[PDB]
Amino acid sequence: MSHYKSNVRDQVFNLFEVFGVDKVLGADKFSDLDADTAREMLTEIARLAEGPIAESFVEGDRNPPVFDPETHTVTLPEGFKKSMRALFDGGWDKVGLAEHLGGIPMPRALQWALIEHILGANPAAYMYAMGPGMSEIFYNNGTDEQKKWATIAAERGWGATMVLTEPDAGSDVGAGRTKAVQQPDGTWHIEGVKRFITSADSDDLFENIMHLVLARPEGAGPGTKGLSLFFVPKFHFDHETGEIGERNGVFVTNVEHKMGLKVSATCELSLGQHGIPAVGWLVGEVHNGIAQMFDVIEQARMMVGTKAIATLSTGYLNALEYAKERVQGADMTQMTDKTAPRVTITHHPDVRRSLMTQKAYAEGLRAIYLYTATFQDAEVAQAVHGVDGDLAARVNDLLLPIVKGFGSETAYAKLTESLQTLGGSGFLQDYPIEQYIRDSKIDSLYAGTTAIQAQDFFFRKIIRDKGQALAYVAGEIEQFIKNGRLKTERELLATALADVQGMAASLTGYLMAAQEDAASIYKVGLGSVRFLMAVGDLLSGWLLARQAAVAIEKLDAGATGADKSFYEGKIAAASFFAKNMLPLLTSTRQIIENLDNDVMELDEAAF
Amino acid sequence: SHYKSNVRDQVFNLFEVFGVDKVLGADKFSDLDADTAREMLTEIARLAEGPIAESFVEGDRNPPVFDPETHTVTLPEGFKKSMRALFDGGWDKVGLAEHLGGIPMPRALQWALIEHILGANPAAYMYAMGPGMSEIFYNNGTDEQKKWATIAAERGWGATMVLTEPDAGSDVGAGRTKAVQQPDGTWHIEGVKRFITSADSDDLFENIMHLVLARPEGAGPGTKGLSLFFVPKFHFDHETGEIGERNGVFVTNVEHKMGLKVSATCELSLGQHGIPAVGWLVGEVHNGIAQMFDVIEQARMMVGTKAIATLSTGYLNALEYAKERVQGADMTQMTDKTAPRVTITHHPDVRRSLMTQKAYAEGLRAIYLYTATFQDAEVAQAVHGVDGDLAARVNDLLLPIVKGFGSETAYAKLTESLQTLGGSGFLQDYPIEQYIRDSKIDSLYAGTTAIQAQDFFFRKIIRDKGQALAYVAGEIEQFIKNNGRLKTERELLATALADVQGMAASLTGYLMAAQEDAASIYKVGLGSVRFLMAVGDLLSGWLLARQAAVAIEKLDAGATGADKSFYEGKIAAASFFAKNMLPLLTSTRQIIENLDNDVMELDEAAF
Numbered sequence A: 001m002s003h004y005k006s007n008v009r010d011q012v013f014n015l016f017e018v019f020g021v022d023k024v025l026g027a028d029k030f031s032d033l034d035a036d037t038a039r040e041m042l043t044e045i046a047r048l049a050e051g052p053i054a055e056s057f058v059e060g061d062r063n064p065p066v067f068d069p070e071t072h073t074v075t076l077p078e079g080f081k082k083s084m085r086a087l088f089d090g091g092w093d094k095v096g097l098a099e100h101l102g103g104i105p106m107p108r109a110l111q112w113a114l115i116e117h118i119l120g121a122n123p124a125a126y127m128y129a130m131g132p133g134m135s136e137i138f139y140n141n142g143t144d145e146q147k148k149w150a151t152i153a154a155e156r157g158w159g160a161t162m163v164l165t166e167p168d169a170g171s172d173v174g175a176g177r178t179k180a181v182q183q184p185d186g187t188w189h190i191e192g193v194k195r196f197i198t199s200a201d202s203d204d205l206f207e208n209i210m211h212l213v214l215a216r217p218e219g220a221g222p223g224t225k226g227l228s229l230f231f232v233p234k235f236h237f238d239h240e241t242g243e244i245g246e247r248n249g250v251f252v253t254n255v256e257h258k259m260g261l262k263v264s265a266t267c268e269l270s271l272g273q274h275g276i277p278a279v280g281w282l283v284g285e286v287h288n289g290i291a292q293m294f295d296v297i298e299q300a301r302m303m304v305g306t307k308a309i310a311t312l313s314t315g316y317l318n319a320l321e322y323a324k325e326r327v328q329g330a331d332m333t334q335m336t337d338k339t340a341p342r343v344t345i346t347h348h349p350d351v352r353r354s355l356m357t358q359k360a361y362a363e364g365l366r367a368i369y370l371y372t373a374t375f376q377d378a379e380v381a382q383a384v385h386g387v388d389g390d391l392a393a394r395v396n397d398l399l400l401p402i403v404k405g406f407g408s409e410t411a412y413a414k415l416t417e418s419l420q421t422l423g424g425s426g427f428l429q430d431y432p433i434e435q436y437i438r439d440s441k442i443d444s445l446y447a448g449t450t451a452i453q454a455q456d457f458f459f460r461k462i463i464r465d466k467g468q469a470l471a472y473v474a475g476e477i478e479q480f481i482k483n484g485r486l487k488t489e490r491e492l493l494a495t496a497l498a499d500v501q502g503m504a505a506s507l508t509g510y511l512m513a514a515q516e517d518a519a520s521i522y523k524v525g526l527g528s529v530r531f532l533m534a535v536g537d538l539l540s541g542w543l544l545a546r547q548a549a550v551a552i553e554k555l556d557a558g559a560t561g562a563d564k565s566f567y568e569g570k571i572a573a574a575s576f577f578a579k580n581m582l583p584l585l586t587s588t589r590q591i592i593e594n595l596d597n598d599v600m601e602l603d604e605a606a607f
Numbered sequence B: 001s002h003y004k005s006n007v008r009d010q011v012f013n014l015f016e017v018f019g020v021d022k023v024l025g026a027d028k029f030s031d032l033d034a035d036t037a038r039e040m041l042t043e044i045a046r047l048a049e050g051p052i053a054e055s056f057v058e059g060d061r062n063p064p065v066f067d068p069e070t071h072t073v074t075l076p077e078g079f080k081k082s083m084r085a086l087f088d089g090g091w092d093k094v095g096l097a098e099h100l101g102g103i104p105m106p107r108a109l110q111w112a113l114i115e116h117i118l119g120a121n122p123a124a125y126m127y128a129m130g131p132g133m134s135e136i137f138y139n140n141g142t143d144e145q146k147k148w149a150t151i152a153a154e155r156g157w158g159a160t161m162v163l164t165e166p167d168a169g170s171d172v173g174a175g176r177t178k179a180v181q182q183p184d185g186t187w188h189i190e191g192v193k194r195f196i197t198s199a200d201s202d203d204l205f206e207n208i209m210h211l212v213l214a215r216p217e218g219a220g221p222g223t224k225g226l227s228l229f230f231v232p233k234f235h236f237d238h239e240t241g242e243i244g245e246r247n248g249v250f251v252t253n254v255e256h257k258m259g260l261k262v263s264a265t266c267e268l269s270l271g272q273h274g275i276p277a278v279g280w281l282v283g284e285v286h287n288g289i290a291q292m293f294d295v296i297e298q299a300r301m302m303v304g305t306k307a308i309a310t311l312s313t314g315y316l317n318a319l320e321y322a323k324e325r326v327q328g329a330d331m332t333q334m335t336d337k338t339a340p341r342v343t344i345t346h347h348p349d350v351r352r353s354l355m356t357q358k359a360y361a362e363g364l365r366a367i368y369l370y371t372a373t374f375q376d377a378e379v380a381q382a383v384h385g386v387d388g389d390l391a392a393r394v395n396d397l398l399l400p401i402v403k404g405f406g407s408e409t410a411y412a413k414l415t416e417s418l419q420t421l422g423g424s425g426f427l428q429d430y431p432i433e434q435y436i437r438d439s440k441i442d443s444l445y446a447g448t449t450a451i452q453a454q455d456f457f458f459r460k461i462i463r464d465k466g467q468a469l470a471y472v473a474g475e476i477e478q479f480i481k482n483n484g485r486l487k488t489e490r491e492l493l494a495t496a497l498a499d500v501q502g503m504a505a506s507l508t509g510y511l512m513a514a515q516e517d518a519a520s521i522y523k524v525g526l527g528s529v530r531f532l533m534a535v536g537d538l539l540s541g542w543l544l545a546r547q548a549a550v551a552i553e554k555l556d557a558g559a560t561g562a563d564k565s566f567y568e569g570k571i572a573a574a575s576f577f578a579k580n581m582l583p584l585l586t587s588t589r590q591i592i593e594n595l596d597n598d599v600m601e602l603d604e605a606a607f
């Protein structure tokens, strides 16, 4: 079979046995979707991901997209286009799409679990297929007239792009110089060159593409808040019928050569530089670009983190299958006996340490993104957590930099253990892990670098939030702590919580001390990413412990066979993570408590 | 041009810190002075930065192509040009014994020279490892065999080490390749070997000497039944060296790898194509694994230096980018969206990461140069006051540090080098993504990190009765006890030293409990790799601190300009490492002190 090793068993356990998302299924917005159908959908997309979607994982890498300068188009490999079709023909492009655009209503915790499987099998496939959901974002932000266009874009399944980055404006989006010039008929002419645009062309996958392009109107202010968002389609079209018309002046001029994620065309997007204007329409006919664009950035950040977690999961499972089957060496209890029976490497403790590490973090991460997703529907947050819409929004925003930044960095780091398990064979392309790594290194970069995530997590999602969302999550962790076979984990989780509390209190000191000493703010930057990672380790230990608490209930209730084995591994993962991962936060708090600006005062030439 | 060298740091280490110049001009190195050595370093560094780094990208993008019916590989023209450059300079004969045409040199200077090739195009050095392996065959050979070794050395033949079979990788002793004795005293070798580096080399050499482990018919099991054989690709005149008829050792496969592509990694079939693979019993004694380990020691030393070289040019590339790249405002001006833009070396997190790349890069350069000062008894005497026997013991202790800690550290910290480049870090246009891909293998070949950790504990500490480790502990303890501008660094080093002693005592405890309960040995396994990494971090902080003390002396004396900056960066690096990396070992010690066999007893099906 294929490279993509699924785990719907773990998804359902999270959705149903731990977070209780089924408690909303069958009622209200999800009236016509019951718990059984949800499991069947999860099983269906997992089989589609393992088959036709994973079919072209290797081809997309070894036979990558090509730029045609004769036509300013991109060619994609045949096998990848075949997988794209399999996804369209199942309607898996309409996941969580609003009902009035042809989607099936769902809790987003379910939606992202469905999404995970595509991202584990062929992540670029899902990215090419985010058009409809970006069309919906255009709908929510559009005028009534534009809402008709957006509807056409969703129903005909046009592709879509996020167009922010320029050569001199990446994390500083506000530094972009692309301009918008208003015309007499109310349209705008966009003029500029954007860089690193995903899916900017897609060969003949779609009949049109919607480019969501950020630009600065003539005479607008500086920074992000001078920016406006424009709807710029690859082709002109009839605003009633949808009939595709004349080519619009927005062309790809180049296709990057990347370490991984190769079948994802990443292009220089040139607007107006080829003899026809790039006409764009101002979204909602208001000047509000960076706020509007962030509805899409927020989705992209959720996707990138889930992708990372999706890829660590099948990394681990590939490594496990290999370890179970590979004979090498004697049991360590028989080390000196050179006649002793050879063993499979799962008998070797460093192998078992590295499998338990991959397992605990993979499953720990899956819980986080699903937990995060239970705060994205007001109805689910109320039903499962008892929190009103405003608190739900805030905790979702708090948790996104975790899903993206902590997921980003952990999945790549732990795939090293994945590959390691294969011994020398991990370095061969014959096995999928080296590509998992190359495909995953980008997740720490696009949709905001990890540092950008950490600076958002602290400055916006905590400080500007006055600690409300952070205080709410800490409250749930404390409640689990204060409540037998779980006493030791709880003791370690209590240390870990104090440690994170320590780190937050320390950093906030450095920040508010900056008013009498401006250089103090650098200590916030020096610690922000480490603080983010600790919060991600704290959440993983907590969520993993919750899961063990339930596995104990189900075991005491008499689970047997394959179920028993599953629940037994939750206990193992939870105690391992408590004992081997969490303690390191104590020394991290202390390191953060003793930060200084020596590294800032040092002259650049001394590096 | 991708490769950024650092002769200055090498000289600073060799001369101002370790005083390797105290042997130049006397005894074995009569005819080589310190001024000459500085010149050899800067020459090979210029060659590596030019003709040898020139084909780094080409070797990767246009990797060797295998012809299966000729059993040969074609290497890309540009890489072969680099090899001839290496040859025309005698850089294939670095440290080779004088009686083989080599220039006598202390091994510390030798690995310093080699570092440049490994940084510019590591696979080029591997192809060029022939003469040094001929010197090993020489040392282990009969008088008649010594004549062959000399021919092979001065004629510049390539060479391989042939151990791995499909089901014998870490367990070399499981290998089934057989050796059949012939009436005249030769042997016919029959078997298939896997993953053999440089097993074919296009036309770079007129012969290749395969050093093959094989089990003579009727010899015992495990590694002790093995014997080493001299198996030449071509038969040759034992007197004149004239090349004769092809020997029956043919490559039947070449792997497709994640990185290090230009290095042919071949399946080697001995005796399978109707022509016998004649082999000669090296030294005409049965002592294979002992003999092959002379080469395995070399290979382990090289892999580590390779990992370290790759991180150094990784960091230096990252530093140049960060110096030139403008993005964002100073965070003391974060709120003002009209504040001047700054180069990213101003941003705390970028400076945290550069400091991290620097401290580890230069910490690891010190470790491998330190290790190399115990590989000449003459140098060990002059620089350390240590007799030949302890010198060999200390060198054996440090090799798994160089290999195990060096491989894992370089790869991980390269993640920071790529991050510093932002999105451009994911592009092939820059060399870091290849650094990563080319570097992942170092944790695997020449023994995996688990194998390194296991060698380190059981053989280099326990079987050693702890005597080498105690010597090193002494030198760290002596540095702590000795100005007061390093008082904080010394306290942190004292903690760390104690923490590592904690680890070593704990693991020794688990070993001795296995006398009464064999399963306790698993605890040693669970902690071995963490322990190895701990000793590595300790050594880096100790060596970085020694460097700071010498930089303080040199700054106090009135250093200026570029020298001043260099010395200042050593101080900042030693202080950062002590305050940001060393404390984590305390947590690690507590984790090791509390290991359990839960993860061992768990049923495999629960993973």
Ligand SMILES: CCCCCCCC(=O)SCCNC(=O)CCNC(=O)[C@H](O)C(C)(C)COP(=O)(O)OP(=O)(O)OC[C@H]1O[C@@H](n2cnc3c(N)ncnc32)[C@H](O)[C@@H]1OP(=O)(O)O
Binding pocket: A127, A130, A160, A161, A162, A164, A165, A170, A171, A172, A173, A174, A198, A199, A223, A224, A225, A290, A291, A294, A297, A300, A446, A447, A448, A449, A452, A456, A460, B337
């Ligand atoms: C196409 C499918 C596949 C795509 C895969 C990935 C695609 C990409 O990579 S797209 C390029 C992604 N680019 C980024 O993510 C930018 C990363 N850099 C940052 O985020 C910086 O921190 C920013 C925010 C750009 C710094 O600019 P500032 O002007 O300095 O930001 P402010 O803090 O002043 O906020 C101003 C304005 O911006 C909105 N905003 C900021 N942050 C958020 C968040 N987390 N969530 C929602 N909105 C946010 C706000 O509207 C804010 O206004 P306010 O007055 O402060 O409320």
Ligand SMILES: CCCCCCCC(=O)SCCNC(=O)CCNC(=O)[C@H](O)C(C)(C)COP(=O)(O)OP(=O)(O)OC[C@H]1O[C@@H](n2cnc3c(N)ncnc32)[C@H](O)[C@@H]1OP(=O)(O)O
Binding pocket: A338, B126, B127, B129, B159, B160, B161, B163, B164, B169, B170, B171, B172, B173, B197, B198, B222, B223, B224, B289, B290, B293, B294, B296, B297, B299, B444, B445, B446, B447, B448, B451, B455, B459
């Ligand atoms: C030329 C192009 C560049 C090539 C680049 C490298 C390519 C490669 O990867 S080459 C293949 C490398 N293969 C390995 O590294 C094997 C890794 N596995 C191990 O090392 C295992 O731990 C071994 C040692 C194979 C375990 O087998 P055992 O029989 O169980 O070993 P013992 O501990 O009982 O000792 C047996 C015998 O071997 C000698 N020995 C062991 N360890 C060493 C070390 N570190 N250094 C020197 N010699 C060693 C000893 O002679 C020992 O006998 P003794 O009675 O204990 O003295």
Ligand SMILES: Cc1cc2nc3c(=O)[nH]c(=O)nc-3n(C[C@H](O)[C@H](O)[C@H](O)COP(=O)(O)OP(=O)(O)OC[C@H]3O[C@@H](n4cnc5c(N)ncnc54)[C@H](O)[C@@H]3O)c2cc1C
Binding pocket: A161, A162, A163, A164, A165, A169, A170, A171, A172, A195, A196, A197, A198, A199, A258, A261, A266, A442, A445, A446, A447, A448, A449, A450, A451, A452, B325, B327, B328, B329, B344, B347, B348, B349, B350, B419, B420, B421, B422, B423, B424, B426
């Ligand atoms: C494969 C790929 C696909 C992409 N697709 C898209 C797309 O579809 N749409 C789109 O709009 N963009 C896209 N991008 C652009 C991507 O979002 C940017 O690369 C990313 O936001 C980082 O910007 P940059 O490359 O300019 O890095 P830089 O902004 O130059 O950052 C370089 C380094 O500086 C650090 N840094 C920068 N500013 C700060 C600060 N204020 N504080 C601390 N550290 C800082 C960063 O951490 C990083 O390590 C894509 C990029 C890639 C690689």
Ligand SMILES: Cc1cc2nc3c(=O)[nH]c(=O)nc-3n(C[C@H](O)[C@H](O)[C@H](O)COP(=O)(O)OP(=O)(O)OC[C@H]3O[C@@H](n4cnc5c(N)ncnc54)[C@H](O)[C@@H]3O)c2cc1C
Binding pocket: A326, A327, A328, A329, A330, A345, A348, A349, A350, A351, A420, A421, A422, A423, A424, A425, A427, B161, B162, B163, B164, B166, B168, B169, B170, B171, B194, B195, B196, B197, B198, B257, B265, B441, B444, B445, B446, B447, B448, B449, B450, B451
């Ligand atoms: C690019 C490349 C080039 C190579 N070149 C050469 C060459 O020139 N010459 C040569 O002789 N060999 C060469 N090799 C072989 C290489 O040395 C082996 O791949 C390596 O030693 C690991 O062996 P293996 O692949 O069989 O993996 P395995 O031994 O099967 O390792 C699988 C996993 O099990 C673990 N494991 C195995 N045994 C134990 C144990 N006892 N205790 C704890 N953990 C254990 C390992 O750490 C690893 O995580 C090369 C390999 C590669 C990838």
